[PDB]
Each structure stands twice: as C-alpha cells, then as structure tokens.
Amino acid sequence: VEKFGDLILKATEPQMVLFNLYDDWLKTISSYTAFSRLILILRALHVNNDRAKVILKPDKTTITEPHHIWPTLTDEEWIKVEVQLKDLILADYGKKNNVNVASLTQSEIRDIILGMEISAPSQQRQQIA
Amino acid sequence: SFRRQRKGYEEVHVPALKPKPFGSEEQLLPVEKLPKYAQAGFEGFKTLNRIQSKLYRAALETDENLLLCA
Amino acid sequence: LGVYLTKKEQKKLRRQTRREAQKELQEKVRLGLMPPPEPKVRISNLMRVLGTEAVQDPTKVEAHVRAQMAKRQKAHEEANAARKLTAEQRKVKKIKKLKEDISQGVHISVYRVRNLSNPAKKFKIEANAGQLYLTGVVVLHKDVNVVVVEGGPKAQKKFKRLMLHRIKNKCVLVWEGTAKDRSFGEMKFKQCPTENMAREHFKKHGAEHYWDLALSESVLESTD
Numbered sequence: 001v002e003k004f005g006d007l008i009l010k011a012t013e014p015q016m017v018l019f020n021l022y023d024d025w026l027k028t029i030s031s032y033t034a035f036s037r038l039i040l041i042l043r044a045l046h047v048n049n050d051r052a053k054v055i056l057k058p059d060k061t062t063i064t065e066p067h068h069i070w071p072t073l074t075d076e077e078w079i080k081v082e083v084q085l086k087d088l089i090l091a092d093y094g095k096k097n098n099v100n101v102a103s104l105t106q107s108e109i110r111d112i113i114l115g116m117e118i119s120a121p122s123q124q125r126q127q128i129a
Numbered sequence: 130s131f132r133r134q135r136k137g138y139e140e141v142h143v144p145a146l147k148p149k150p151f152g153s154e155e156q157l158l159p160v161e162k163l164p165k166y167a168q169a170g171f172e173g174f175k176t177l178n179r180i181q182s183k184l185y186r187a188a189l190e191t192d193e194n195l196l197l198c199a
Numbered sequence: 200l201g202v203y204l205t206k207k208e209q210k211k212l213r214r215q216t217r218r219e220a221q222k223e224l225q226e227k228v229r230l231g232l233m234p235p236p237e238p239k240v241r242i243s244n245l246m247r248v249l250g251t252e253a254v255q256d257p258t259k260v261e262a263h264v265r266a267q268m269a270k271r272q273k274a275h276e277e278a279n280a281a282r283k284l285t286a287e288q289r290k291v292k293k294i295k296k297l298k299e300d301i302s303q304g305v306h307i308s309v310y311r312v313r314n315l316s317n318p319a320k321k322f323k324i325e326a327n328a329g330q331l332y333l334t335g336v337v338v339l340h341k342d343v344n345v346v347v348v349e350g351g352p353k354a355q356k357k358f359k360r361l362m363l364h365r366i367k368n369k370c371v372l373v374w375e376g377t378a379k380d381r382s383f384g385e386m387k388f389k390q391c392p393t394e395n396m397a398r399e400h401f402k403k404h405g406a407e408h409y410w411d412l413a414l415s416e417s418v419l420e421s422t423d
Contacts, residue, residue: 029261030242036257079258086255110254136231 001045002053003069023068028075037082041070043113044085047092055084089113151179158182163189239271240264298332299351304377305334306355308348311413314368315344321388327361328386336383338397338410339390345397345413347406349381373412382406 025034044052057063057071058081064071073081086109087101093112094101104112111117130141151157157179160171167189171177177185180199188195204212227233240248245264253260286294315321321337324346328335333350348358355375362370382404391397394414401410 029258030245032242032246033253033257033261036253040254040257075258075262079256079262082256082258106251106255110251113254134231134234 001069003064020068023070024072037078040082040085040089040113043115044088047089051088052085055081055088058084086113155183158185237267240267242268297353299353301351301354304379305349305381306352306377307335307374308355308359308372309374309409309412310344310346310348310362310370311373311416312344312346312368312370313342315339320366323366324362325386325388327358331357333358333386334381334383335386337386337388338400339388340392340394340397343413343417345409347383347409349378349383371416373416374409 021038022031022034025037029037041052041056044055058073058077062071062073062077089112090101090104090109093099093104130143132139132141134140157176159176160168160174162185163171180197184195184197187193188197224233224236228235238244238248242264245253245260249260249264324337327333328348328350331350331354333348333354335346335348335350337347338345346362348355350358359372359375363372383406389397389400391400394410398407398410401407
C-alpha cells in the first residue's frame with residue numbers, strides 16, 4: 001500500500017506504530033464484513049497491485065484523506081469495488097492455471113480468495129480405488 | 130407475471146397482451162392497392178397484414194432505408 | 200357471570216393455539232401455498248448461514264442480512280403501530296370515558312370545611328369535579344364551606360381521599376350516602392353571607408338538610 005511502503009523504508013529508527021485498517025467501515029458495517037473485504041482487498045493487491053490500485057478508486061472524485069488508508073466510498077460503491085476485485089482475483093487463477101472462471105464453483109472461489117490451494121503429483125495412488 | 134413458486138419451481142405467467150386497435154385511417158389493406166410490379170409478389174394472399182399495410186408506402190413507394198422493428 | 204380459567208389452563212390454551220398456527224404454516228409450506236421459510240440470519244449468524252458467500256461479496260451479504268433484519272423489525276414495528284391505532288380512537292374517548300356506571304344511584308358526599316379562603320383549593324376541587332364528571336355545588340359562608348358532590352362511586356372514593364388527605368381549619372364529611380336522582384347541576388360557586396340565603400338556595404333542589412346539618416355541626420363544635 002502507498003501509505004506503508006515509503007513510510008517504513010525511510011524510518012531511520014525501529015519503532016512501534018498503530019494504524020486503523022478499518023477506516024470508517026465499522027461505523028456502517030460489522031467487523032466480520034470489514035475483515036472479509038479487507039482480506040479480499042489484500043488478496044487483490046497481492047495479485048496485481050497494478051490494476052487493483054486502479055480498482056480501489058472507482059471515480060476521479062474518490063480521494064483518501066490523510067487520516068486513514070483506504071479511500072472513502074459509498075456502501076454500494078464498496079459493493080461494486082468488491083465485485084470488481086473478486087473478478088480481478090479470479091482473473092489470475094484463470095490465467096496462470098488455464099481454467100475457465102465459470103468452472104469455479106462457489107465453494108472453491110472461497111478457497112481461492114482465502115489462499116488455500118491443493119496439488120497432487122502422485123496420481124498413481126489411484127491404486128487405492 | 131405470476132412470479133409464484135408452487136413446488137420446486139417459480140412459475141411467472143404474463144397474460145395475453147391486447148392488440149393495438151385500428152384507427153379511423155388505418156386498416157388491413159388488400160392486394161388490390163398494390164401496383165403491377167408488386168401484385169405478382171403477393172401470390173395467394175388476397176389481403177395483407179397490419180404491419181405490412183401500416184408501412185406499405187414507406188417501403189414500396191419510398192426508396193429510403195427501412196428499419197422494421199416487427 | 201364470567202369464569203376465570205386457571206394459569207395451567209391458560210398455558211394449555213396458549214400452547215394449543217401456537218401449535219395450531221405452527222401446523223397451519225407447516226401444511227401451507229408442505230402444499231406450496233407459501234414459500235419455504237428462509238433461515239433467520241443476524242450479524243452473529245451471518246458467518247454460519249451466509250459464510251461461503253460472504254467471502255466473495257462480503258458487503259452484498261451484509262446488506263442482504265441487514266435488509267432481512269430490518270424487514271423483521273419492519274413487520275414487528277408495523278404490527279405494534281397497527282394495534283396502537285386502536286388507542287388512537289379508543290383513548291380519551293374509549294379508554295378514559297367510563298363515568299363509573301352512575302345510572303341507578305348517585306353517591307353524594309357533603310363536606311364542611313372551616314377555612315376555604317384559598318382560591319387554589321377551590322380551583323383544584325373544580326378541576327377534580329370536572330375531570331371525574333362529578334356533579335355538585337359549593338356554598339360559602341362565615342367559617343362554613345359546604346361542598347356537596349354527587350357522582351359515581353369511584354369519583355366519590357377519589358374525592359373522599361383528595362379532600363381529606365390530598366388537600367389541607369378542618370374538613371369532615373357530614374353526610375355520605377346515595378340518592379334516587381341528581382339534584383345539583385354543574386360545578387359552580389356561590390357565596391352566601393347569610394344562612395337564610397344559603398338555605399333558600401339549598402331548598403331549590405330539595406337539599407335543605409345539608410345546610411341544617413352543617414349549622415348543627417358548627418353549633419356542636421362551638422358549644423363544646
């Protein structure tokens with residue numbers, strides 16, 4: 001995030017700092033949805049950090065006040081940003097794994113967002129059945 | 130539409146829409162008003178449709194680009 | 200007369216009615232009349248019912264859950280307000296207009312106050328007579344305040360406690376009984392410096408004994 005990298009690179013001494021990753025969401029949504037959208041946003045940033053930064057501001061009139069980190073958005077604006085970021089997070093899974101996004105069931109999209117992946121080099125264990 | 134879920138499926142039923150009534154200067158024109166170049170094309174049809182008669186002069190007497198949203 | 204079903208019997212009746220309504224709903228859902236009930240989801244319930252869909256679109260799920268919560272509150276609030284509408288008409292006209300059923304007998308209380316020179320006590324007595332719909336009159340004379348109040352039994356029981364305990368020279372009820380019909384009109388004030396002018400006014404309605412009892416009580420109090 002733009003408010004953390006340059007902040008800590010030029011910190012001349014070790015120190016302890018406090019941030020509020022929930023800017024003003026807690027005034028309109030519960031901590032469960034706040035954490036879910038925060039995990040989704042962080043996953044999107046970890047995925048691209050290039051298109052995601054474009055998604056994070058949906059309109060040229062959306063700015064981030066110096067008090068907090070994420071931009072201030074309307075509730076439905078946040079809904080649209082979250083669905084766009086979900087599409088972004090599914091995009092690299094579709095690309096780097098050469099699979100269709102529609103082939104992803106609602107159960108495995110959740111695993112993709114969270115960050116759980118499975119592999120199986122030893123398919124010969126098909127002998128068990 | 131009904132938009133009601135009876136048992137396992139939601140059935141939405143919209144009824145039969147009433148047709149547009151013909152005005153005092155709009156009627157189903159027969160094949161007796163078509164010219165000789167157009168009377169040969171209407172073989173077996175003594176009359177024409179309502180949409181064919183409502184835009185008859187706009188497509189046969191006028192050579193403009195017609196856009197029929199039928 | 201009416202009968203009172205006991206507490207266990209009330210519990211049985213309520214339980215049977217609730218089970219009847221529940222079975223009505225269950226058979227409506229069985230036959231497809233009503234859509235099957237949706238799970239009731241609160242904020243603490245959001246991660247158990249909508250958990251898998253709240254990771255993909257967390258804010259849409261939050262909005263849907265809060266809309267369901269509001270709709271549950273919308274129904275309850277509307278229901279309470281709808282029943283409350285009854286009071287709108289059944290209030291100062293049907294929840295405060297009783298009149299104590301004063302049709303066959305009017306309880307009459309006659310009090311004799313020694314000092315009633317304060318207008319605040321007379322105004323409070325007039326307000327209590329007009330609010331409780333109790334008829335009567337008040338006659339003033341030299342150290343004699345004869346207040347006759349004819350009304351219902353509840354209004355007489357309220358006026359006996361208001362004049363003897365809620366209002367302060369001493370007040371004593373000289374005659375507490377019932378009558379056939381009403382004799383005095385609305386609550387009015389009348390000052391009579393002479394006893395004959397008060398006795399002629401009390402005899403116009405056939406209540407001349409109230410002044411003679413109040414004169415005799417004052418004579419018996421001044422004698423001993």
